[PDB]
Design an enzyme around this catalytic site. Structure first.
Site, PDB file in Angstrom:
ATOM      1  N   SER A 186       0.833  -1.195   0.000  1.00  0.00           N
ATOM      2  CA  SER A 186       0.000   0.000   0.000  1.00  0.00           C
ATOM      3  C   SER A 186       0.879   1.261   0.000  1.00  0.00           C
ATOM      4  CB  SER A 186      -0.915  -0.057   1.236  1.00  0.00           C
ATOM      5  OG  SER A 186      -1.609   1.152   1.478  1.00  0.00           O
ATOM      6  N   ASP A 284      -7.728  -5.180  -7.063  1.00  0.00           N
ATOM      7  CA  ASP A 284      -7.409  -3.947  -6.346  1.00  0.00           C
ATOM      8  C   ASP A 284      -7.890  -2.881  -7.334  1.00  0.00           C
ATOM      9  OD1 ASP A 284      -6.260  -1.607  -5.313  1.00  0.00           O
ATOM     10  OD2 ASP A 284      -4.411  -2.630  -4.715  1.00  0.00           O
TER      11      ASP A 284
HETATM   12  C1  LIG Z   1      -9.635   2.330   3.226  1.00  0.00           C
HETATM   13  C2  LIG Z   1      -9.015   1.296   3.030  1.00  0.00           C
HETATM   14  C3  LIG Z   1      -7.652   1.174   3.428  1.00  0.00           C
HETATM   15  C4  LIG Z   1      -7.391  -0.345   3.000  1.00  0.00           C
HETATM   16  C5  LIG Z   1      -8.279  -0.404   1.852  1.00  0.00           C
HETATM   17  C6  LIG Z   1      -9.545   0.141   2.451  1.00  0.00           C
HETATM   18  C7  LIG Z   1     -10.186  -0.935   3.405  1.00  0.00           C
HETATM   19  C8  LIG Z   1      -9.123  -1.904   3.935  1.00  0.00           C
HETATM   20  C9  LIG Z   1      -7.752  -1.194   4.313  1.00  0.00           C
HETATM   21  C10 LIG Z   1      -6.668  -2.029   4.778  1.00  0.00           C
HETATM   22  C11 LIG Z   1      -6.561  -2.450   6.149  1.00  0.00           C
HETATM   23  C12 LIG Z   1      -5.382  -3.337   6.389  1.00  0.00           C
HETATM   24  C13 LIG Z   1      -4.205  -3.135   5.587  1.00  0.00           C
HETATM   25  O1  LIG Z   1      -3.350  -2.139   6.207  1.00  0.00           O
HETATM   26  C14 LIG Z   1      -4.482  -2.715   4.038  1.00  0.00           C
HETATM   27  C15 LIG Z   1      -3.172  -2.520   3.356  1.00  0.00           C
HETATM   28  C16 LIG Z   1      -5.405  -3.779   3.469  1.00  0.00           C
HETATM   29  O2  LIG Z   1      -5.159  -4.679   2.850  1.00  0.00           O
HETATM   30  O3  LIG Z   1      -6.759  -3.373   3.883  1.00  0.00           O
HETATM   31  C17 LIG Z   1      -5.409  -1.522   4.025  1.00  0.00           C
HETATM   32  C18 LIG Z   1      -5.878  -0.708   2.734  1.00  0.00           C
HETATM   33  C19 LIG Z   1      -4.876   0.376   2.385  1.00  0.00           C
HETATM   34  O4  LIG Z   1      -4.370   1.143   3.149  1.00  0.00           O
HETATM   35  O5  LIG Z   1      -4.648   0.355   1.090  1.00  0.00           O
END
Ligand SMILES: C=C1C[C@]23C[C@H]1CC[C@H]2[C@@]12CC[C@H](O)[C@@](C)(C(=O)O1)[C@H]2[C@@H]3C(=O)O
Lengths: 339, 60
Positions: A186, A284
Protein backbone atom coordinates in the site's frame (compact mmCIF):
# COMPACT_ATOMS: atom_id res chain seq x y z
CA UNK A 1 -28.02 -0.81 -2.34
CA UNK A 2 -25.38 -2.39 -0.10
CA UNK A 3 -24.66 -5.99 -1.12
CA UNK A 4 -21.30 -7.54 -0.28
CA UNK A 5 -22.04 -11.03 -1.55
CA UNK A 6 -19.76 -10.36 -4.52
CA UNK A 7 -16.61 -9.71 -2.48
CA UNK A 8 -17.22 -12.82 -0.35
CA UNK A 9 -16.89 -15.00 -3.44
CA UNK A 10 -13.21 -14.19 -3.97
CA UNK A 11 -11.69 -14.49 -0.49
CA UNK A 12 -11.74 -16.85 2.51
CA UNK A 13 -14.39 -15.85 5.04
CA UNK A 14 -11.96 -14.92 7.83
CA UNK A 15 -9.98 -12.75 5.42
CA UNK A 16 -13.24 -11.10 4.39
CA UNK A 17 -14.02 -10.39 8.02
CA UNK A 18 -10.58 -8.89 8.72
CA UNK A 19 -10.56 -6.52 5.73
CA UNK A 20 -14.25 -5.65 6.06
CA UNK A 21 -13.77 -4.84 9.74
CA UNK A 22 -11.00 -2.38 8.82
CA UNK A 23 -13.23 -1.00 6.05
CA UNK A 24 -16.13 -0.16 8.37
CA UNK A 25 -13.89 1.17 11.14
CA UNK A 26 -12.03 3.40 8.70
CA UNK A 27 -15.35 4.75 7.40
CA UNK A 28 -15.81 6.14 10.91
CA UNK A 29 -12.27 7.49 11.27
CA UNK A 30 -12.33 9.52 8.03
CA UNK A 31 -14.44 12.67 8.36
CA UNK A 32 -16.09 14.42 5.36
CA UNK A 33 -14.34 17.67 6.27
CA UNK A 34 -10.90 16.10 5.91
CA UNK A 35 -10.23 15.63 9.61
CA UNK A 36 -9.33 12.25 11.11
CA UNK A 37 -10.40 10.68 14.42
CA UNK A 38 -6.83 9.83 15.46
CA UNK A 39 -7.74 9.06 19.08
CA UNK A 40 -10.33 6.45 18.11
CA UNK A 41 -8.05 5.15 15.36
CA UNK A 42 -5.21 4.38 17.74
CA UNK A 43 -7.66 2.92 20.25
CA UNK A 44 -9.22 0.50 17.74
CA UNK A 45 -5.95 -0.60 16.17
CA UNK A 46 -4.61 -3.88 17.55
CA UNK A 47 -0.99 -3.45 18.64
CA UNK A 48 1.78 -5.57 20.13
CA UNK A 49 5.03 -4.78 21.93
CA UNK A 50 8.48 -5.92 20.87
CA UNK A 51 9.84 -9.07 22.51
CA UNK A 52 13.48 -10.03 23.06
CA UNK A 53 12.30 -13.61 23.62
CA UNK A 54 12.43 -15.62 20.40
CA UNK A 55 8.97 -16.74 19.30
CA UNK A 56 8.73 -19.11 16.36
CA UNK A 57 12.39 -18.32 15.67
CA UNK A 58 12.07 -14.53 15.69
CA UNK A 59 12.67 -11.84 18.31
CA UNK A 60 12.34 -8.06 18.13
CA UNK A 61 13.26 -4.75 19.69
CA UNK A 62 12.34 -1.10 19.22
CA UNK A 63 14.80 1.68 18.50
CA UNK A 64 14.39 5.45 18.70
CA UNK A 65 16.12 6.67 15.54
CA UNK A 66 15.22 10.36 15.83
CA UNK A 67 14.19 12.06 19.06
CA UNK A 68 13.00 15.37 17.61
CA UNK A 69 10.06 13.58 16.01
CA UNK A 70 10.07 10.45 18.19
CA UNK A 71 10.68 8.26 15.14
CA UNK A 72 10.74 4.58 16.09
CA UNK A 73 11.55 1.47 14.06
CA UNK A 74 11.15 -2.13 15.16
CA UNK A 75 13.97 -4.54 14.38
CA UNK A 76 13.18 -8.22 13.78
CA UNK A 77 15.95 -10.81 13.84
CA UNK A 78 16.16 -14.60 13.71
CA UNK A 79 16.90 -16.21 17.10
CA UNK A 80 20.60 -16.36 17.96
CA UNK A 81 22.17 -19.78 17.55
CA UNK A 82 23.43 -21.48 20.71
CA UNK A 83 22.04 -18.81 23.02
CA UNK A 84 21.72 -20.20 26.55
CA UNK A 85 19.74 -17.21 27.87
CA UNK A 86 17.35 -14.74 26.22
CA UNK A 87 18.81 -11.48 24.84
CA UNK A 88 19.32 -8.77 27.47
CA UNK A 89 19.04 -5.11 26.44
CA UNK A 90 22.80 -5.33 25.87
CA UNK A 91 22.59 -8.26 23.43
CA UNK A 92 20.16 -6.77 20.89
CA UNK A 93 22.79 -5.43 18.48
CA UNK A 94 24.98 -8.52 18.18
CA UNK A 95 26.75 -8.46 14.76
CA UNK A 96 24.94 -10.47 12.09
CA UNK A 97 26.68 -13.72 11.23
CA UNK A 98 26.72 -14.78 7.60
CA UNK A 99 28.53 -14.09 4.34
CA UNK A 100 25.41 -12.35 3.05
CA UNK A 101 22.65 -11.17 5.38
CA UNK A 102 19.82 -9.33 3.62
CA UNK A 103 18.12 -6.55 5.58
CA UNK A 104 14.61 -5.56 4.57
CA UNK A 105 13.67 -1.97 5.44
CA UNK A 106 9.88 -2.28 5.54
CA UNK A 107 7.17 0.40 5.38
CA UNK A 108 3.65 -0.65 6.42
CA UNK A 109 0.51 0.16 4.44
CA UNK A 110 -2.57 2.04 5.57
CA UNK A 111 -2.89 4.65 2.82
CA UNK A 112 -0.53 7.08 4.64
CA UNK A 113 -2.98 7.64 7.51
CA UNK A 114 -3.44 4.27 9.21
CA UNK A 115 -1.42 1.72 11.18
CA UNK A 116 1.96 1.57 12.87
CA UNK A 117 5.05 -0.61 12.98
CA UNK A 118 3.56 -2.13 16.14
CA UNK A 119 0.15 -2.87 14.58
CA UNK A 120 -0.45 -6.61 14.92
CA UNK A 121 -1.08 -7.11 11.20
CA UNK A 122 2.33 -5.66 10.37
CA UNK A 123 4.29 -7.11 13.28
CA UNK A 124 3.04 -10.51 12.10
CA UNK A 125 3.91 -9.81 8.46
CA UNK A 126 7.44 -8.76 9.44
CA UNK A 127 7.98 -11.84 11.58
CA UNK A 128 6.85 -14.01 8.67
CA UNK A 129 9.28 -12.22 6.34
CA UNK A 130 12.18 -12.97 8.70
CA UNK A 131 11.37 -16.68 8.69
CA UNK A 132 10.45 -17.05 5.03
CA UNK A 133 13.37 -15.00 3.70
CA UNK A 134 15.86 -15.80 6.47
CA UNK A 135 16.78 -12.14 6.86
CA UNK A 136 16.59 -9.18 9.21
CA UNK A 137 13.61 -6.83 8.98
CA UNK A 138 13.47 -3.21 10.14
CA UNK A 139 9.93 -1.79 10.20
CA UNK A 140 9.62 2.01 10.18
CA UNK A 141 6.97 3.71 12.30
CA UNK A 142 6.68 6.62 9.88
CA UNK A 143 4.46 9.64 10.59
CA UNK A 144 0.87 9.53 9.29
CA UNK A 145 -1.37 12.00 7.46
CA UNK A 146 -3.33 14.18 7.76
CA UNK A 147 -1.43 15.39 10.83
CA UNK A 148 1.98 14.75 9.27
CA UNK A 149 1.40 14.85 5.49
CA UNK A 150 3.89 14.86 2.62
CA UNK A 151 6.85 14.73 2.80
CA UNK A 152 6.96 13.44 6.40
CA UNK A 153 6.60 9.78 5.46
CA UNK A 154 9.43 9.98 2.93
CA UNK A 155 11.68 11.94 5.29
CA UNK A 156 11.17 9.33 8.00
CA UNK A 157 12.04 6.59 5.53
CA UNK A 158 15.21 8.45 4.55
CA UNK A 159 16.28 8.77 8.19
CA UNK A 160 15.59 5.07 8.74
CA UNK A 161 17.57 4.10 5.62
CA UNK A 162 20.63 6.00 6.83
CA UNK A 163 20.28 4.47 10.29
CA UNK A 164 20.20 0.96 8.82
CA UNK A 165 23.06 1.61 6.40
CA UNK A 166 25.21 2.94 9.24
CA UNK A 167 24.74 -0.03 11.59
CA UNK A 168 28.10 -1.79 11.82
CA UNK A 169 26.32 -4.84 13.24
CA UNK A 170 24.22 -5.25 10.08
CA UNK A 171 27.20 -5.47 7.72
CA UNK A 172 27.52 -8.66 5.67
CA UNK A 173 30.93 -10.35 5.89
CA UNK A 174 31.22 -10.79 2.11
CA UNK A 175 31.65 -7.13 1.20
CA UNK A 176 31.46 -5.40 4.60
CA UNK A 177 28.31 -3.62 3.43
CA UNK A 178 24.72 -3.68 4.65
CA UNK A 179 22.63 -5.41 1.97
CA UNK A 180 19.49 -3.29 1.91
CA UNK A 181 16.17 -4.13 0.28
CA UNK A 182 13.26 -1.69 0.53
CA UNK A 183 9.78 -3.17 0.93
CA UNK A 184 6.25 -2.00 1.57
CA UNK A 185 2.58 -2.63 0.90
CA UNK A 186 0.00 0.00 0.00
CA UNK A 187 1.39 3.44 0.95
CA UNK A 188 4.49 1.65 2.17
CA UNK A 189 5.28 0.58 -1.37
CA UNK A 190 4.99 4.18 -2.51
CA UNK A 191 7.39 5.22 0.28
CA UNK A 192 9.87 2.53 -0.81
CA UNK A 193 9.88 3.86 -4.37
CA UNK A 194 10.58 7.41 -3.21
CA UNK A 195 13.18 6.45 -0.62
CA UNK A 196 14.95 4.49 -3.36
CA UNK A 197 15.02 7.57 -5.59
CA UNK A 198 16.65 9.55 -2.80
CA UNK A 199 19.12 6.76 -2.02
CA UNK A 200 20.35 6.57 -5.61
CA UNK A 201 20.98 10.31 -5.52
CA UNK A 202 23.03 10.09 -2.32
CA UNK A 203 25.29 7.11 -2.96
CA UNK A 204 23.45 4.59 -0.79
CA UNK A 205 23.04 1.43 -2.84
CA UNK A 206 19.70 -0.35 -2.43
CA UNK A 207 19.82 -3.89 -3.81
CA UNK A 208 16.12 -4.24 -4.56
CA UNK A 209 12.59 -2.95 -3.96
CA UNK A 210 9.57 -5.07 -3.08
CA UNK A 211 6.22 -3.36 -3.67
CA UNK A 212 3.02 -5.13 -2.61
CA UNK A 213 -0.18 -3.60 -4.02
CA UNK A 214 1.65 -0.23 -4.06
CA UNK A 215 -0.40 2.93 -3.59
CA UNK A 216 -0.11 5.17 -6.66
CA UNK A 217 -2.65 7.30 -8.50
CA UNK A 218 -3.23 10.23 -10.83
CA UNK A 219 -5.82 12.77 -11.92
CA UNK A 220 -7.38 10.37 -14.42
CA UNK A 221 -9.95 7.76 -13.46
CA UNK A 222 -8.66 4.45 -14.78
CA UNK A 223 -10.92 1.69 -16.07
CA UNK A 224 -10.19 -0.54 -13.06
CA UNK A 225 -11.18 2.30 -10.73
CA UNK A 226 -14.48 2.82 -12.51
CA UNK A 227 -15.28 -0.89 -12.83
CA UNK A 228 -14.16 -2.08 -9.38
CA UNK A 229 -15.28 0.91 -7.29
CA UNK A 230 -16.64 -0.36 -3.98
CA UNK A 231 -16.74 -4.00 -5.09
CA UNK A 232 -13.70 -5.26 -3.21
CA UNK A 233 -13.34 -3.29 0.04
CA UNK A 234 -12.08 -0.04 -1.51
CA UNK A 235 -13.82 3.00 -3.00
CA UNK A 236 -12.57 5.79 -5.23
CA UNK A 237 -14.12 8.14 -2.69
CA UNK A 238 -11.82 6.95 0.09
CA UNK A 239 -8.81 6.85 -2.28
CA UNK A 240 -9.47 10.53 -3.05
CA UNK A 241 -9.72 11.23 0.69
CA UNK A 242 -6.33 9.72 1.52
CA UNK A 243 -4.58 11.46 -1.37
CA UNK A 244 -6.05 14.81 -0.29
CA UNK A 245 -4.92 14.18 3.29
CA UNK A 246 -1.36 13.27 2.27
CA UNK A 247 -0.64 15.67 -0.59
CA UNK A 248 0.21 19.37 -0.09
CA UNK A 249 -2.67 21.82 0.13
CA UNK A 250 -3.73 22.85 -3.36
CA UNK A 251 -2.02 19.96 -5.12
CA UNK A 252 -3.66 17.36 -7.34
CA UNK A 253 -2.90 13.71 -8.04
CA UNK A 254 -0.33 14.43 -10.73
CA UNK A 255 2.09 15.48 -7.99
CA UNK A 256 5.07 13.06 -8.19
CA UNK A 257 4.28 11.74 -4.69
CA UNK A 258 1.02 10.38 -6.05
CA UNK A 259 2.02 9.59 -9.64
CA UNK A 260 5.72 8.62 -9.94
CA UNK A 261 5.35 8.70 -13.72
CA UNK A 262 3.58 12.04 -13.88
CA UNK A 263 4.96 14.56 -16.39
CA UNK A 264 6.22 16.33 -13.26
CA UNK A 265 8.30 13.37 -12.11
CA UNK A 266 11.97 13.09 -13.02
CA UNK A 267 12.80 10.52 -15.69
CA UNK A 268 14.22 7.17 -14.57
CA UNK A 269 15.87 6.59 -17.95
CA UNK A 270 19.58 6.06 -17.40
CA UNK A 271 19.15 6.32 -13.63
CA UNK A 272 20.72 4.04 -11.04
CA UNK A 273 17.60 2.37 -9.62
CA UNK A 274 17.36 -1.02 -7.85
CA UNK A 275 15.68 -4.06 -9.39
CA UNK A 276 12.00 -4.29 -8.46
CA UNK A 277 9.45 -6.98 -7.59
CA UNK A 278 6.00 -5.48 -8.15
CA UNK A 279 2.97 -7.39 -6.93
CA UNK A 280 -0.43 -6.35 -8.25
CA UNK A 281 -3.72 -7.71 -6.96
CA UNK A 282 -6.12 -8.10 -9.87
CA UNK A 283 -9.11 -7.04 -7.79
CA UNK A 284 -7.41 -3.95 -6.35
CA UNK A 285 -9.31 -0.99 -7.82
CA UNK A 286 -6.06 0.88 -8.56
CA UNK A 287 -4.71 -2.13 -10.47
CA UNK A 288 -4.28 -0.07 -13.64
CA UNK A 289 -2.04 2.47 -11.87
CA UNK A 290 0.07 -0.33 -10.45
CA UNK A 291 0.40 -2.06 -13.81
CA UNK A 292 1.30 1.32 -15.30
CA UNK A 293 4.00 1.68 -12.64
CA UNK A 294 5.61 -1.65 -13.52
CA UNK A 295 5.44 -0.74 -17.21
CA UNK A 296 6.93 2.66 -16.44
CA UNK A 297 9.98 1.07 -14.84
CA UNK A 298 10.41 -1.40 -17.70
CA UNK A 299 10.12 1.42 -20.23
CA UNK A 300 12.80 3.33 -18.32
CA UNK A 301 15.09 0.34 -18.75
CA UNK A 302 14.84 -0.71 -15.10
CA UNK A 303 14.86 -4.33 -13.96
CA UNK A 304 11.32 -5.26 -12.97
CA UNK A 305 9.50 -8.50 -12.20
CA UNK A 306 5.72 -8.18 -12.32
CA UNK A 307 3.39 -10.51 -10.43
CA UNK A 308 -0.19 -9.88 -11.54
CA UNK A 309 -2.41 -12.00 -9.31
CA UNK A 310 -5.72 -12.09 -11.20
CA UNK A 311 -8.12 -12.90 -8.37
CA UNK A 312 -6.23 -11.41 -5.42
CA UNK A 313 -7.69 -8.48 -3.46
CA UNK A 314 -6.07 -5.89 -1.20
CA UNK A 315 -4.73 -7.46 2.00
CA UNK A 316 -4.18 -10.97 0.58
CA UNK A 317 -0.81 -11.13 2.38
CA UNK A 318 -2.17 -10.66 5.92
CA UNK A 319 -3.28 -14.30 6.33
CA UNK A 320 -1.35 -17.41 5.17
CA UNK A 321 -4.52 -19.05 3.86
CA UNK A 322 -4.34 -18.51 0.11
CA UNK A 323 -2.04 -19.18 -2.84
CA UNK A 324 -1.39 -15.51 -3.54
CA UNK A 325 0.29 -15.29 -0.13
CA UNK A 326 2.32 -18.47 -0.65
CA UNK A 327 3.33 -17.60 -4.23
CA UNK A 328 4.34 -14.06 -3.27
CA UNK A 329 6.33 -15.09 -0.20
CA UNK A 330 8.20 -17.58 -2.38
CA UNK A 331 9.12 -14.86 -4.88
CA UNK A 332 10.11 -12.39 -2.18
CA UNK A 333 12.58 -14.88 -0.73
CA UNK A 334 13.98 -15.71 -4.17
CA UNK A 335 14.24 -11.97 -4.90
CA UNK A 336 16.17 -10.97 -1.78
CA UNK A 337 18.39 -14.06 -1.83
CA UNK A 338 19.14 -14.07 -5.56
CA UNK A 339 22.70 -13.52 -6.79
CA UNK B 1 -12.56 -22.80 18.90
CA UNK B 2 -11.04 -19.43 18.03
CA UNK B 3 -9.63 -18.57 14.61
CA UNK B 4 -5.88 -18.57 15.20
CA UNK B 5 -5.09 -16.69 12.00
CA UNK B 6 -7.17 -13.75 13.24
CA UNK B 7 -6.02 -14.13 16.85
CA UNK B 8 -2.41 -13.46 15.86
CA UNK B 9 -3.72 -10.24 14.28
CA UNK B 10 -5.34 -9.14 17.54
CA UNK B 11 -8.91 -10.29 16.89
CA UNK B 12 -10.94 -12.83 18.84
CA UNK B 13 -13.46 -14.65 16.66
CA UNK B 14 -14.78 -18.19 17.11
CA UNK B 15 -14.39 -20.12 13.86
CA UNK B 16 -17.98 -21.35 14.22
CA UNK B 17 -19.20 -17.75 14.36
CA UNK B 18 -17.24 -16.39 11.39
CA UNK B 19 -20.34 -16.27 9.17
CA UNK B 20 -22.32 -14.47 11.88
CA UNK B 21 -19.58 -11.86 12.22
CA UNK B 22 -19.51 -11.50 8.42
CA UNK B 23 -23.27 -10.91 8.49
CA UNK B 24 -22.93 -8.22 11.17
CA UNK B 25 -20.25 -6.40 9.19
CA UNK B 26 -22.59 -6.16 6.22
CA UNK B 27 -25.53 -5.11 8.36
CA UNK B 28 -23.31 -2.34 9.74
CA UNK B 29 -22.26 -1.18 6.27
CA UNK B 30 -25.95 -1.03 5.33
CA UNK B 31 -26.74 1.28 8.25
CA UNK B 32 -23.69 3.43 7.52
CA UNK B 33 -24.84 3.89 3.92
CA UNK B 34 -28.10 5.27 5.32
CA UNK B 35 -26.49 7.70 7.77
CA UNK B 36 -22.09 8.10 16.74
CA UNK B 37 -18.45 7.21 17.40
CA UNK B 38 -18.31 8.78 20.84
CA UNK B 39 -19.67 5.62 22.42
CA UNK B 40 -17.43 3.45 20.24
CA UNK B 41 -14.37 4.05 22.41
CA UNK B 42 -16.04 2.17 25.27
CA UNK B 43 -16.30 -1.15 23.43
CA UNK B 44 -13.70 -3.92 23.30
CA UNK B 45 -12.29 -3.78 19.69
CA UNK B 46 -10.81 -7.29 19.79
CA UNK B 47 -14.19 -8.98 20.29
CA UNK B 48 -15.60 -8.45 16.80
CA UNK B 49 -18.93 -10.18 17.45
CA UNK B 50 -19.85 -8.02 20.44
CA UNK B 51 -18.20 -4.93 18.97
CA UNK B 52 -20.33 -5.09 15.82
CA UNK B 53 -23.44 -5.97 17.81
CA UNK B 54 -22.89 -2.91 19.99
CA UNK B 55 -22.30 -0.65 17.00
CA UNK B 56 -25.41 -1.94 15.21
CA UNK B 57 -27.43 -0.91 18.26
CA UNK B 58 -25.88 2.56 18.47
CA UNK B 59 -27.08 3.11 14.92
CA UNK B 60 -30.56 2.01 13.83
C1 LIG C 1 -9.63 2.33 3.23
C2 LIG C 1 -9.01 1.30 3.03
C3 LIG C 1 -7.65 1.17 3.43
C4 LIG C 1 -7.39 -0.34 3.00
C5 LIG C 1 -8.28 -0.40 1.85
C6 LIG C 1 -9.55 0.14 2.45
C7 LIG C 1 -10.19 -0.93 3.40
C8 LIG C 1 -9.12 -1.90 3.94
C9 LIG C 1 -7.75 -1.19 4.31
C10 LIG C 1 -6.67 -2.03 4.78
C11 LIG C 1 -6.56 -2.45 6.15
C12 LIG C 1 -5.38 -3.34 6.39
C13 LIG C 1 -4.21 -3.13 5.59
O1 LIG C 1 -3.35 -2.14 6.21
C14 LIG C 1 -4.48 -2.72 4.04
C15 LIG C 1 -3.17 -2.52 3.36
C16 LIG C 1 -5.41 -3.78 3.47
O2 LIG C 1 -5.16 -4.68 2.85
O3 LIG C 1 -6.76 -3.37 3.88
C17 LIG C 1 -5.41 -1.52 4.03
C18 LIG C 1 -5.88 -0.71 2.73
C19 LIG C 1 -4.88 0.38 2.39
O4 LIG C 1 -4.37 1.14 3.15
O5 LIG C 1 -4.65 0.35 1.09
Amino acid sequence: EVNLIESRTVVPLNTWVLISNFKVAYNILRRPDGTFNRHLAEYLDRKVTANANPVDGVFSFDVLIDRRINLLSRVYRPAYADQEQPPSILDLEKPVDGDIVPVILFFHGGSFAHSSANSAIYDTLCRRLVGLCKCVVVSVNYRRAPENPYPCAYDDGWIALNWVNSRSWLKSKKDSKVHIFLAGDSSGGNIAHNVALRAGESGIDVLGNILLNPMFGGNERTESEKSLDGKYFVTVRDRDWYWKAFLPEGEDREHPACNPFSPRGKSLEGVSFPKSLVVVAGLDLIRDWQLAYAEGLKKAGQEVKLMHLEKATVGFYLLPNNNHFHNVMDEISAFVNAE
Amino acid sequence: GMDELLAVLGYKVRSSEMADVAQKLEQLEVMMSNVLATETVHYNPAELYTWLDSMLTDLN
